[PDB]
RNA sequence: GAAUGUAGUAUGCGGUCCUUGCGGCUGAGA
């Protein structure tokens, strides 16, 4: 039922707080995590909610370029609906319905829920590269074979959807095993004359193998090009460390930011009674990848420029490549901004 | 918390939740009082063929003291609180 | 704690001597405490016999036994005044009517506690740091040396008898010479009258009490 | 040996210790408020620094020499200031929960198997320290809830 | 997110951006990013002082909107005559924030769920770190990571403002310095030697004129021709760019460590455990933070604040060349900065 | 899509009460809410919690097959052995969605028919 | 299995503080001076650098520089209590920065081949900054344990 | 016997307030 799949790289430029209100814990406000592994995660319902909100805003403001041409939803509504189009745009003008392309791609409004569904199925954003502080260098981008196995298993989903062959051959040579006291890291972190690297508060002996990091690096180039979210990818290859699954789990659990927010009584000038609460934030420069699966638009009476999924894919790629979103909500305090870079596989 | 709660810290836990989720102290105290009074009368279905406990609940008596004499008061109080929250959820859905 | 076994407040950027605003606030508060103790020593002791007895017991526990030594002197008066201003600020409402003469104007106890703030209310006066005016930094030196020559150091430390031995070992500490001009500034947040009262009290404190080290030897004294 | 029985043991133990502190130090509200604030602050210290770091930090606020690290030998009533009493009581509760749970009779008998949690951090692996960290965070959450419920400041 | 304003913070006095969530060797640390360690001021703390300062200006009727005084009592009365006195009583008893503040920053904690604020105060990142030097007493130090993060900030405002012309100002910066190398002006390099001394290290000087000039131009565009009290050209020769880890070492070591004591009048010395250490951001440090402005979501807005542009100019005209207090130790003259409101 | 040997090291057989308790409480409960763009906050009453089966959950279902009703069927689907091979081949290594959260990336399951 | 460096830090600090407490239990002055020196050392390191602190420790020891091998120092061979405390502090710091908690331990030591004073003498500033962080951390642990279990003055 | 769809745990909140790096020491001995 799905013909094309487009990946969605996410690079946090500010701390990200995806709130998880379904937690029976009063110590802090935690970010949602995969319960069975503890890895940080952003649910598709949250990710789709910010995608649909951003896409609707662009269509309302007439900024989406379709087939290298501007899109006019108002004019297209007359071409699509003809009769009762003026009645329909009143609902959108009253914020009761969403513009045409938004309803085609993500789905109709709550009132018109039973009319049809959307064209895309926003996946779940999972961890790919975690930033932890290191003794040598400012910090390091960390991953693990479990994350790598998850990424390779994700390409099987795309390969099966598009009936491709080279997609599953991308990581077919990835057989990386790591002891608890071993790691594979670049030369920007290795302590001089020791073959050791100190991530956070752990000393890890450096393994002697360069193919694992090299093939991993070029995989990101396939999905994100050479421009690694504004910086050359070779500049960050030297600071990528591969740690064991258990060691990576410790980094995900405890190295996330914890901030002690507070409110102060204006009259007294000190902290108000009972006004003290702490939150947990995903660290900045955290790389997460989603997987958007898009099928044919269920709703009929649609313009030729959005005929098939391939036509729909180019709309998402153009309007979202190298774009900044706000996932999770702490917007008023400048938290949640993330760079987004889409792109289909080979 | 209804699964893991006991009669000793019933009042303290309820008071904490009320003062946390209320608007002021008087509303929290009123919620604590109404929860404490109402949740006493709730019928329970134990695994054993026990109707005496329901008979004690049906009137309002030394059942509270009898609960201390009773050998499975923890299950009784847990079922009582869970049923009271279930019925108040029904009422809230009805009004809303 | 420096390698030289001594140090001096030098600015991290320009390496000039300066007086931190915390020191100014502390010396102003302590001069207010001393003036209050001298002016109304026994009165507040009568008003606050309970806390003074508690303080005497605390001193007794710390200092050997001294079960009822507790000399009701200016030291204990200042101690109980500080305890009132630090942990029993609510009890100061009774003595808020009292006024102490500083310079020419009078200042209420409530005015003082509003100036310096408490554990539950922020102070109403901002105490800025003091810096030397750069005009004189070229003509006269802003830094100079001083001498510490502790004869009888073993007598003071190891308990040896005094007399004409224990050859002294001298060490030196840096200090700004006398006559160096400084600029002070205090800003209020609610009432400017509070700012001017704090300015007068701080001026009197620097005139009499003095700030910095060796304030008991006449060091750190200022004049108009 | 399910989750809910562990939660029952945590609730019972936290209520017991908070009630003991409330009854023993009912007159002085300063120590009660200090204990409540220290409890509500403790788990975040553990998250930011670690269980060993916060355990040592608690041990450094005793204003009295300690012969050897041991929670049983502590006696918070000896200290005078409310701060030291609160720190000693919090450390004692944390260590006794991590070393004995709710007693040997209860389902949860602790993790360190009677050892001082500071020693357990000292000579055990990182995985065990992480598990003890999670247990300490959970018990501290329960203690904070009960202290906010009962203790007055 | 229609328009974004960049706020520049320059510390006249040491700033203790309190953290209060950790313990260290030198007690009372400052809030820093965990994975990097660079000193930052989180948006929540920075927003609070801005909101608090805004309240005093409005409550004292000092805000100049469209070069006109803002009488909030009548403005609220005209806008909300249905409950003009009811709302006034709420702010009279400090239960609610005044009219303008709720529009700009957001409603008070009492009315949390009424709407959302129109301002997204970003975190304040380190831009220039003053580091002691042999010649050129202190050098403004920057790192490739900082400018790279600055480049992404310019990309964000460019996307928000839909102005590509501002997205290529600093795009010509790409430097790969080793630990022992640096890019510094002539004022820091020792005479007769291609080496510089930055408070603990001897770094060989790498020669490339455009890198500093590009950065110098960026600040000139960002904050005008007055660098908080001195010409930019007077400081263009004092800027030094150091390696990534060298900059990290400087921020983790060169921060001010101040020893403070409490003197009990009973004895005259330091009390029992009455001494503690406080960590401060060094004086003359530069920190920037974007102030994103969205559509004001309040109902029945006045015509003077209806759109984002009218909000932006009010923010600029009220928070430019002003002095604020950041962090604790307000009463002892600490945490004072001079703020500059700049637009790309 | 994973090596079989990498799975053999991660089986943990527990007691029935422990296993039963895990399935009740170790599943992901996800809080959900709808936001109105008019105010930017949440809508009153638009808050609820939904529970999801965790990923990496190996389910298995027995598929019972019988001889189809004789209605002049094609020559390739006469007996049961032919009608099961088509089902197994067309569904092995498939990827279909179950449940009512397809649009938010919930439901995709990899199927392995037993050959 | 892996072991976090914080565990090695705590173990080393507890070992050295317990060793000085047990060896000089009668010497109250030695314990008090060592506690004061341990609490004052990190500030000196921050103000003047690690190498200056290490040399200043030897200045009070009256031993000359450039012959500084910590293995060749008998800290008990000094008559004065201040000299004893300074020798103990210098030996502990140098041992941590040169060997860590032992070769078999998780932390094998930063310098690992010579005395940390010589390391600061003839090595780049990034390595001395790493050593400064390590020294500050171990000094914090030692100060905590000394303030807890050692008699003050 | 056969025969879901639509949905951002978000909105508002300053790790603040109170704390003198103080205490003691002959640039002197012939």
Short mmCIF file of N, CA and C in Angstrom, two decimals, chain D residues 46-105:
data_model
loop_
_atom_site.label_atom_id
_atom_site.label_comp_id
_atom_site.label_asym_id
_atom_site.label_seq_id
_atom_site.Cartn_x
_atom_site.Cartn_y
_atom_site.Cartn_z
N UNK D 46 21.60 12.87 42.13
CA UNK D 46 22.03 11.54 41.71
C UNK D 46 22.10 11.45 40.20
N UNK D 47 21.11 12.02 39.51
CA UNK D 47 21.10 11.97 38.05
C UNK D 47 22.26 12.76 37.46
N UNK D 48 22.53 13.95 38.01
CA UNK D 48 23.56 14.81 37.43
C UNK D 48 24.97 14.32 37.74
N UNK D 49 25.21 13.85 38.97
CA UNK D 49 26.55 13.48 39.40
C UNK D 49 26.74 11.98 39.57
N UNK D 50 25.78 11.29 40.18
CA UNK D 50 25.91 9.87 40.41
C UNK D 50 25.58 9.48 41.84
N UNK D 51 25.27 8.20 42.06
CA UNK D 51 24.92 7.75 43.40
C UNK D 51 26.10 7.87 44.36
N UNK D 52 27.30 7.49 43.91
CA UNK D 52 28.46 7.60 44.77
C UNK D 52 28.77 9.03 45.16
N UNK D 53 28.68 9.95 44.20
CA UNK D 53 28.99 11.35 44.48
C UNK D 53 28.04 11.93 45.51
N UNK D 54 26.73 11.68 45.34
CA UNK D 54 25.77 12.23 46.29
C UNK D 54 25.83 11.52 47.63
N UNK D 55 26.18 10.23 47.64
CA UNK D 55 26.37 9.53 48.91
C UNK D 55 27.54 10.12 49.68
N UNK D 56 28.65 10.39 48.99
CA UNK D 56 29.78 11.04 49.65
C UNK D 56 29.42 12.45 50.10
N UNK D 57 28.65 13.17 49.28
CA UNK D 57 28.24 14.52 49.65
C UNK D 57 27.37 14.52 50.90
N UNK D 58 26.48 13.54 51.02
CA UNK D 58 25.70 13.40 52.25
C UNK D 58 26.60 13.11 53.44
N UNK D 59 27.58 12.23 53.26
CA UNK D 59 28.48 11.86 54.34
C UNK D 59 29.36 13.02 54.80
N UNK D 60 29.55 14.03 53.96
CA UNK D 60 30.42 15.15 54.29
C UNK D 60 29.71 16.23 55.10
N UNK D 61 28.43 16.06 55.40
CA UNK D 61 27.65 17.05 56.14
C UNK D 61 27.28 16.54 57.53
N UNK D 62 28.20 15.85 58.19
CA UNK D 62 27.93 15.24 59.48
C UNK D 62 28.56 15.98 60.65
N UNK D 63 29.40 16.99 60.39
CA UNK D 63 30.01 17.85 61.41
C UNK D 63 30.64 17.05 62.55
N UNK D 64 31.03 15.80 62.27
CA UNK D 64 31.61 14.94 63.29
C UNK D 64 32.42 13.87 62.60
N UNK D 65 33.60 13.51 63.11
CA UNK D 65 34.39 12.45 62.48
C UNK D 65 33.65 11.12 62.48
N UNK D 66 33.78 10.39 61.38
CA UNK D 66 33.21 9.05 61.23
C UNK D 66 34.35 8.05 61.21
N UNK D 67 34.24 7.01 62.04
CA UNK D 67 35.28 5.99 62.10
C UNK D 67 35.37 5.22 60.79
N UNK D 68 34.22 4.84 60.22
CA UNK D 68 34.19 4.09 58.97
C UNK D 68 32.81 4.26 58.36
N UNK D 69 32.75 4.21 57.03
CA UNK D 69 31.48 4.41 56.33
C UNK D 69 30.52 3.28 56.70
N UNK D 70 29.42 3.64 57.34
CA UNK D 70 28.41 2.68 57.78
C UNK D 70 27.13 3.40 58.16
N UNK D 71 26.01 3.00 57.57
CA UNK D 71 24.74 3.66 57.86
C UNK D 71 24.17 3.25 59.21
N UNK D 72 24.46 2.03 59.67
CA UNK D 72 23.92 1.57 60.94
C UNK D 72 24.46 2.40 62.10
N UNK D 73 25.75 2.74 62.06
CA UNK D 73 26.38 3.46 63.16
C UNK D 73 25.93 4.91 63.27
N UNK D 74 25.19 5.43 62.28
CA UNK D 74 24.80 6.83 62.32
C UNK D 74 23.77 7.07 63.42
N UNK D 75 23.71 8.31 63.89
CA UNK D 75 22.76 8.72 64.92
C UNK D 75 22.45 10.19 64.71
N UNK D 76 21.43 10.50 63.91
CA UNK D 76 21.17 11.90 63.55
C UNK D 76 20.81 12.79 64.72
N UNK D 77 20.34 12.23 65.84
CA UNK D 77 19.96 13.05 66.98
C UNK D 77 21.16 13.72 67.64
N UNK D 78 22.37 13.20 67.42
CA UNK D 78 23.55 13.77 68.06
C UNK D 78 23.83 15.18 67.56
N UNK D 79 23.65 15.42 66.27
CA UNK D 79 24.00 16.71 65.69
C UNK D 79 23.02 17.79 66.12
N UNK D 80 23.50 19.03 66.15
CA UNK D 80 22.71 20.13 66.64
C UNK D 80 21.92 20.88 65.58
N UNK D 81 22.60 21.32 64.52
CA UNK D 81 21.94 22.09 63.48
C UNK D 81 20.97 21.21 62.69
N UNK D 82 19.91 21.83 62.19
CA UNK D 82 18.91 21.10 61.42
C UNK D 82 19.47 20.55 60.12
N UNK D 83 20.42 21.27 59.51
CA UNK D 83 20.98 20.83 58.23
C UNK D 83 21.66 19.48 58.37
N UNK D 84 22.54 19.34 59.36
CA UNK D 84 23.27 18.08 59.53
C UNK D 84 22.33 16.95 59.90
N UNK D 85 21.33 17.22 60.74
CA UNK D 85 20.35 16.20 61.11
C UNK D 85 19.61 15.71 59.87
N UNK D 86 19.17 16.65 59.03
CA UNK D 86 18.44 16.28 57.82
C UNK D 86 19.31 15.47 56.87
N UNK D 87 20.56 15.90 56.66
CA UNK D 87 21.45 15.14 55.79
C UNK D 87 21.70 13.74 56.33
N UNK D 88 21.93 13.62 57.64
CA UNK D 88 22.18 12.32 58.23
C UNK D 88 20.97 11.41 58.09
N UNK D 89 19.77 11.94 58.35
CA UNK D 89 18.57 11.12 58.23
C UNK D 89 18.34 10.67 56.80
N UNK D 90 18.53 11.57 55.83
CA UNK D 90 18.34 11.21 54.43
C UNK D 90 19.33 10.13 54.01
N UNK D 91 20.60 10.30 54.38
CA UNK D 91 21.61 9.31 54.02
C UNK D 91 21.31 7.97 54.68
N UNK D 92 20.90 7.99 55.95
CA UNK D 92 20.57 6.75 56.64
C UNK D 92 19.41 6.03 55.96
N UNK D 93 18.36 6.77 55.60
CA UNK D 93 17.21 6.15 54.94
C UNK D 93 17.61 5.56 53.59
N UNK D 94 18.35 6.33 52.79
CA UNK D 94 18.77 5.84 51.48
C UNK D 94 19.60 4.57 51.61
N UNK D 95 20.60 4.59 52.49
CA UNK D 95 21.49 3.45 52.61
C UNK D 95 20.77 2.24 53.18
N UNK D 96 19.88 2.43 54.16
CA UNK D 96 19.18 1.29 54.72
C UNK D 96 18.20 0.70 53.72
N UNK D 97 17.57 1.53 52.88
CA UNK D 97 16.72 0.98 51.83
C UNK D 97 17.54 0.21 50.80
N UNK D 98 18.70 0.75 50.42
CA UNK D 98 19.51 0.09 49.40
C UNK D 98 20.22 -1.15 49.92
N UNK D 99 20.36 -1.29 51.24
CA UNK D 99 21.08 -2.42 51.81
C UNK D 99 20.17 -3.49 52.40
N UNK D 100 18.96 -3.13 52.84
CA UNK D 100 18.06 -4.09 53.45
C UNK D 100 16.64 -4.03 52.90
N UNK D 101 16.34 -3.09 52.01
CA UNK D 101 14.97 -2.96 51.53
C UNK D 101 14.04 -2.60 52.67
N UNK D 102 12.96 -3.36 52.80
CA UNK D 102 12.00 -3.21 53.89
C UNK D 102 12.15 -4.32 54.91
N UNK D 103 13.37 -4.78 55.13
CA UNK D 103 13.64 -5.88 56.03
C UNK D 103 13.73 -7.21 55.30
N UNK D 104 14.36 -8.18 55.97
CA UNK D 104 14.53 -9.50 55.38
C UNK D 104 13.20 -10.22 55.23
N UNK D 105 12.22 -9.90 56.08
CA UNK D 105 10.91 -10.55 55.98
C UNK D 105 10.17 -10.13 54.72
#
